């Protein structure tokens, strides 16, 4: 009557569409998670920046006055 | 070439299309499993670790805020 | 003061309950996705089984 493979391809493609939709939803959720984490951690680069600035500042001061003593 | 074999070749194309579709489905399902079961939990673990970071150093944060009005 | 402490214990246990139920829902959702994938790939077997019912079925006849 009808080509046997037609229904097979129909079902296979339908399932492919379904799981690709699942993939899209999963990656969208992942993107939301990453955005949340970045916004939350936006304090950490501030922390790191001021810490690095303090380190450079104390090193420069130990250069300006010669209190920098030999290593151990 | 042959007529019986040319109908055979049409059927070959049908078989190859089916098996390629099956392989594609398997690959996409593996990708979905990798995303859902591995990548997202590790992202969540990294989130928890970074939260513990910012929690442990909050005493420095509050000092710097008290004098810098940041 | 005691009522406040009661309330804060409530909030603590409720938030941990919320996160645990989150975990439960996510696990069940993943399991359901996998199961429905199994069903989707399996549904085609009914037709071939029905075709092979013509050779041997046993109790039915």
């Amino acid at each position: 009557m009808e080509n046997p493979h037609e229904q097979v391809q129909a079902n296979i493609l339908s399932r492919i569409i379904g799981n690709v939709k699942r993939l899209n939803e999963s990656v969208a959720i992942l993107n939301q998670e990453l955005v949340t984490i970045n916004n939350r951690n936006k304090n950490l680069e501030i922390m790191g920046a001021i810490c690095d600035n303090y380190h450079s500042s104390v090193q420069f001061n130990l250069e300006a006055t010669n209190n920098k003593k030999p290593p151990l | 070439m042959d007529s019986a074999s040319k109908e055979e070749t049409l059927e070959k194309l049908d078989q190859e299309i089916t098996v390629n579709l099956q392989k594609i489905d398997s690959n996409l399902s593996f990708c979905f499993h990798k995303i859902t079961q591995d990548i997202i939990p590790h992202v969540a673990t990294y989130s928890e670790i970074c939260e513990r970071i910012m929690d442990s150093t909050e005493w420095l944060g509050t000092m710097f805020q008290e004098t810098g009005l940041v | 003061t005691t009522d406040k402490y009661f309330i804060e214990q409530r909030n603590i246990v409720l938030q941990e309950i919320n996160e645990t139920m989150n975990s439960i829902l996510n696990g069940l959702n993943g399991l359901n996705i996998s199961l429905e994938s199994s069903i989707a790939v399996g549904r085609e077997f009914q037709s071939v089984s029905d075709l092979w019912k013509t050779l041997y079925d046993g109790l039915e006849s």
Partner: peptide
């Protein structure tokens, strides 16, 4: 009637 990946988070 097909479940969709919906990771719940927070409250």
């Amino acid at each position: 009637s097909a479940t969709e990946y919906r990771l719940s988070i927070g409250s």
